[PDB]
Design a binder for this molecule. Structure first.
Ligand SMILES: CC1(C)[C@H]2CC=C(C[N+](C)(C)Cc3ccc(-c4ccccc4I)cc3)[C@@H]1C2
Lengths: 336, 215, 279, 233, 53
């Protein structure tokens, strides 16, 4: 009974302190920064061969190889430069909502409605891709996957809980709790010591991977957060919501810096990504388009008109030389 | 592709493309049906030819030169809105209801209304099954169908009671171009695959009418 | 002449938009969509010659023999293309509605370019004679100048019979069979869409019959007159020429109507058009 | 484990015919291109024939074109070589090799054990200047081999392979394009070069590094080897 | 009665953070995207000779 009052007043103290820091809005400091101009980007590649809708995609750290997951039960590894199909992996279950590419490139991960994260070893002595391990323990579907090393991976489920695994042993090293709704995405910090997760409770929180503790929690979205990504320097991140807006949060300031809404936008964002510098913010919507945002001034700097269906995934190469987008029309398109 | 090793890589890519195409062909005669309903609704015992195969359960019985896949999403215990779009392309939705569980009738109706009007299922037809007639006939005599539906005004006979139940379920459509194929089945009813097949036949024909430009 | 030009404008606008809409797709096109696009292209090419026929029937041919050959080849090619494409569309509908269970596919776009290319090649081979034999002649019966054949009367009869049996009878029989069976299957189905399907099919069949039967009926009349089954006289010949003119007008009207009776009534095509206009 | 074993060699009369069989066991044989390489008594490796995955592409050396034919039996996991008219120049130990080609692969990693065949009685040229190189353990060594054309390509990949053959054993892959360490070899080996001059350098030489080192070009068929450089202890 | 016990404890941890002015935090983001501005191919088109696509 009394704790409820204590809970309410603690929230007020956070907000009151949060209000003290705000002196000038992000848009009010960077008003005299010259714009970026119309960002005209044209398709360069069109990877076709996926039959059903594409739900996930990840870039190799070498900025040349790709991995994409489709509802047809196939996981294809593409050579971006030539459009060659390096690998094609059959999946046990055709309901896949995520996929990840290991930093070393030796392994690849997959998961979905089956509640299992499957890990496939690509560099085998037998010349074929085999499932090295299957990770179980989540009681709901799997939303995201991100490798930390060759022997450590982070997952998020609709169970309202994230986890950290030890692929060698196969058990669950640490479990992160605190969300009150489905967890829909996460992005690993560049130094791989913290990460953030966007949930359906209209909130995102910052987690210490080593300590298994929630360091911070960020609010402001009116609906579920569909996607999330770290700023390149690791001191901010951006979230995409069904609210039809994206927002930029700062860890040190611990607030929301800017919003990326336009009156002509009505649908929700499905993916979010940054450029190598961090000035462009690319997000994919349900209107079959991706908008490039001048993250420093919140202006539509361009549109990637393409695809005949919803855009489900986004990606930018570690070198920043290309952008890849997948859609429900079963096509990946590379832009430059 | 000039280089000798780049020529062999191009060959490997084509061998993959060929296998992808063949797999698509072999998985083209399959009709995907989504199973829904509350617990103890008979959703696990519709067609006695199961051949099954926590998470998502699939069943892949075959009948009359056609491959039917029945997907059961029970046990997810999550918010449907975030995984329902995965089934946007199913041919039809099979819905099961238990006529002998009055206290669960309201939950079934709430489920039906939400699914029938989902933005993703604006075009997918529904096959409503009203299971366990025999218990319904035995239970109605002892307990009138007034406690579950206080607004019921018709007689207390089996024929009239069932029609009212079906009417309420059909009353949630609130849209054209989507039809509901309601049927009544018992525990000892072997001909359940036949009902799904012919209903799917009408669903397929209706879709072709749209594709062929006749609608 | 105003109605002729008005017919010209609507035909160009109708077919052109249909062709534009279908070409604005980034993915595969349904079999019937491909056939509709080919029919629109063929009908556009055919209607491009409307002023030529109007001028020739008005006063006389003054464009020389080369333009005769070119226009005649164009016209025969597009005429046979239209007939065979309508037959192919009816067959496609039959296969997709009567044998829908046995041709079910899980969303692969079946390519149909083979039939389109075969139809176009057969049309070109049928029209070959136009490139060689059609020319301009100075008649002594009417004191005018028209564009006509120079084949022997037996050759003219053979060509007329070929036209009748390869442009009208076979397409008509194919359409009748296909659409009658489509109606039979639809009337024993369950849904809220069968009503409009039956109505549209009946409308299409009636339009085709009542727009094509008159011209080929006049052609059969001329064949009978040239075969000795009928007597030649000035009044009969004048009536035959008047029937030719009116039937050709009706045929051009059908060609201008074709976009409306095959494309604009479908929900898919209307949504495609609206989306293209929005872009 | 991976295993290629060959059989069918022996003594044959000139002008006769024999068939060599190479049975694979322990990998996805259907996905690997397969080569035949022969080494006449104390002469040096020489490429013979190549059959791709799916049997789409087949190549032969000019020496054996017309006489030899290579066939693959995927269901039975066997590789064949049919030799029709054998001269006295075909006597050699024939090796069965496996190659898989995709972006970033190692296409000559595993070699067969070899079968001995005895018979009674334009191209890129790669040269290894030195034939022998005395050395003691713990001393750095360097081996170099030139070429006629520049093995560098528009891709930026230099197509040069380094193989080590130990006394009485089959060759082993060390460096597959110009500097990439083949899986399983110690990191002491290194490779470098530019265009037409290459060098393989060994640091902290061990007692197991004694053998013959061959350099091969995979830029275009027919594949050609070097003369070979021998290390003496 | 016990489910909310840990909820208040988490807030106490989250309320004790040494925050900084948004003016400083915003400025740092502006500086980063400017220093690493010449190394971003998408922001400024790269010559067609250096473009792998
Ligand atoms: C066009 C020419 C300039 C050259 C070719 C033939 C000409 C005369 N002719 C033969 C009368 C053209 C003709 C043919 C068929 C139809 C028609 C009938 C029914 C349905 C649709 C159609 I279309 C209409 C007109 C003039 C010389």
């Amino acid at each position: 009974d009394q704790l409820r009052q204590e809970a309410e007043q603690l929230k007020n103290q956070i907000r009151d302190a949060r209000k003290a820091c705000a002196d000038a809005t992000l848009s009010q400091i960077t008003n005299n920064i010259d714009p970026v101009g119309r960002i005209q980007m044209r398709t360069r590649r069109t990877l076709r061969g996926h039959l059903a809708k594409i739900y996930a995609m990840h870039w190799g750290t070498d900025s040349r190889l790709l991995v994409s997951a489709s509802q047809d039960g196939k996981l294809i590894i593409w050579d971006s430069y030539t459009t060659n199909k390096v690998h094609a992996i059959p999946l046990r279950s055709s309901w896949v909502m995520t996929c990840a590419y290991a930093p070393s490139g030796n392994y690849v991960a997959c998961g979905g409605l089956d509640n299992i994260c499957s890990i496939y070893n690509l560099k085998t002595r037998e010349g074929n891709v085999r499932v090295s391990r299957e990770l179980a323990g989540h009681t709901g579907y799997l939303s995201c996957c991100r490798f930390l090393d060759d022997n450590q991976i982070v997952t998020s489920s609709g169970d309202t809980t994230c986890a950290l695994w030890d692929i060698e042993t196969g058990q669950q090293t640490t479990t992160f709790t605190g969300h009150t709704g489905d967890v829909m995405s996460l992005s690993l910090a560049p130094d791989t010591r913290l990460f953030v997760s966007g949930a359906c409770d209209a909130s995102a929180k910052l987690w210490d991977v080593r300590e298994g503790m929630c360091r911070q929690t960020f609010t402001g979205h009116e609906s579920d957060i569909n996607a999330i990504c770290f700023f390149p320097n690791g001191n901010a991140f951006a979230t995409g919501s069904d609210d039809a807006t994206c927002r930029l949060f700062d860890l040190r300031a611990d607030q929301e810096l800017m919003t990326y809404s336009h009156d002509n936008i009505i649908c929700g964002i499905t993916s979010v990504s940054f450029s190598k510098s961090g000035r462009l913010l690319l997000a994919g919507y349900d209107d079959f388009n991706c908008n490039v945002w001048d993250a420093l001034k919140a202006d539509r700097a361009g549109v990637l008109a393409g695809h005949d269906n919803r855009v489900s995934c986004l990606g930018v190469t570690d070198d920043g030389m290309a952008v890849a987008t997948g859609s429900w029309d079963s096509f990946l398109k590379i832009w430059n | 592709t000039l280089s000798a090793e780049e020529r062999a890589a191009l060959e490997r890519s084509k061998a993959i493309e060929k296998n992808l195409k063949e797999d698509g062909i072999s998985a083209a005669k399959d009709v995907k049906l989504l199973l829904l309903g509350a617990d103890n609704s008979g959703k696990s015992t519709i067609v006695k030819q199961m051949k099954i195969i926590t998470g998502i359960v699939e069943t892949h019985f075959t009948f009359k030169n056609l491959h039917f896949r029945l997907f059961d999403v029970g046990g997810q215990r999550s918010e449907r809105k975030k995984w329902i779009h995965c089934f946007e392309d199913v041919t039809a939705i099979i819905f099961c209801v238990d006529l002998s569980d009055y206290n669960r009738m309201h939950e079934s109706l709430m489920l039906f209304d939400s699914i029938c009007n989902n933005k993703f299922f604006i075009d997918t037809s529904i096959i409503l099954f009203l299971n366990k007639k025999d218990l319904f006939g035995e239970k109605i005599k002892k307990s009138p169908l007034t406690i579950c539906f206080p607004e019921y005004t018709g007689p207390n006979t089996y024929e009239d009671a069932a029609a009212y139940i079906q009417a309420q379920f059909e009353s949630k459509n609130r849209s054209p171009n989507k039809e509901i194929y309601c049927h009544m089945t018992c525990a000892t009813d072997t001909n359940n695959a036949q009902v799904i097949f012919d209903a799917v036949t009408d669903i397929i024909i209706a879709n072709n009418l749209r594709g062929c430009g006749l609608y | 002449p105003a109605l002729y030009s008005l017919l010209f404008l609507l035909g160009l606008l109708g077919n052109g938009a249909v062709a534009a809409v279908l070409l604005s797709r980034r993915t595969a096109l349904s079999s019937t969509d491909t056939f509709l696009l080919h029919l629109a292209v063929a009908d556009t090419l055919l209607v491009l010659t409307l002023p030529l026929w109007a001028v020739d029937a008005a006063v006389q041919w003054v464009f020389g023999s080369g333009l005769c050959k070119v226009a005649g080849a164009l016209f025969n090619i597009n005429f046979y293309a239209g007939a065979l494409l309508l037959a192919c569309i009816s067959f496609d509908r039959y296969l997709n509605i009567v044998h829908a269970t046995q041709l079910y596919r899980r969303g692969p776009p079946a390519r149909v370019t083979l039939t389109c290319l075969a139809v176009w090649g057969l049309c070109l081979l049928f029209a070959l004679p136009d490139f060689i034999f059609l020319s301009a002649h100075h008649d002594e019966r009417l004191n005018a100048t028209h564009c006509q054949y120079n084949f022997p009367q037996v050759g003219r009869t053979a060509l007329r019979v070929l036209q009748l049996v390869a442009g009208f009878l076979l397409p008509l029989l194919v359409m009748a069979y296909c659409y009658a069976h489509i109606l039979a299957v639809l009337l024993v189905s369950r849904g809220q869409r069968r009503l409009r399907a039956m109505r549209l099919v009946v409308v299409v069949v009636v339009a085709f019959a009542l727009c094509w039967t008159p011209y080929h009926l006049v052609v059969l009349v001329d064949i009978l007159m040239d075969l000795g089954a009928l007597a030649r006289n000035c009044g009969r010949e004048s009536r035959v020429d008047v029937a030719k003119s009116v039937t050709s007008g009706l045929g051009y009207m059908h060609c201008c109507l074709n976009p409306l009776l095959y494309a604009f009534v479908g929900v898919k095509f209307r949504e495609r058009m609206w989306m293209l206009l929005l872009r | 484990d991976v295993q290629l074993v060959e059989s069918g060699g022996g003594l044959v009369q000139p002008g006769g015919s024999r068939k060599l069989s190479c049975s694979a066991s322990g990998f996805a044989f259907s996905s690997f291109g397969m080569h035949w390489v022969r080494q006449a008594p104390e002469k040096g490796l020489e490429w013979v024939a190549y059959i791709s995955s799916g049997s789409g592409t087949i190549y032969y050396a000019d020496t054996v074109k017309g006489r030899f034919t290579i066939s693959r039996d995927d269901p039975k996991n066997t590789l064949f070589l049919q030799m029709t008219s054998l001269r006295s120049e075909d006597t050699a130990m024939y090796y069965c090799v496996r190659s898989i080609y995709y972006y970033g692969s190692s296409p000559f990693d595993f070699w067969g054990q070899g079968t001995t065949l005895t018979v009674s009685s334009s191209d890129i040229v790669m040269t290894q200047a030195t034939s022998s190189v005395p050395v003691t353990p713990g001393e750095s060594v360097s081996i170099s081999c030139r070429s006629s054309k520049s093995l560098l390509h528009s891709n930026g990949n230099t197509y040069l392979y380094w193989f080590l053959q130990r006394p009485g054993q089959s060759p082993q892959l060390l460096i597959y394009r110009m500097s990439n360490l083949a899986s399983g070899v110690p990191d002491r080996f290194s490779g470098s070069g530019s265009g037409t001059a290459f060098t393989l350098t060994i640091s902290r030489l061990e007692a197991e590094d004694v053998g013959v080192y061959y350099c091969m070009q995979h830029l275009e068929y027919p594949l050609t080897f070097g003369a070979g450089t021998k290390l003496e202890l | 009665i016990a489910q909310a016990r840990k909820l208040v404890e988490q807030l106490k941890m989250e309320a004790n953070i040494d925050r900084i002015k948004v003016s400083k935090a915003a400025a740092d983001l502006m500086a980063y995207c400017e220093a690493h501005a010449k190394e971003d191919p998408l922001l400024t088109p790269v010559p067609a000779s250096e473009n792998p696509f």
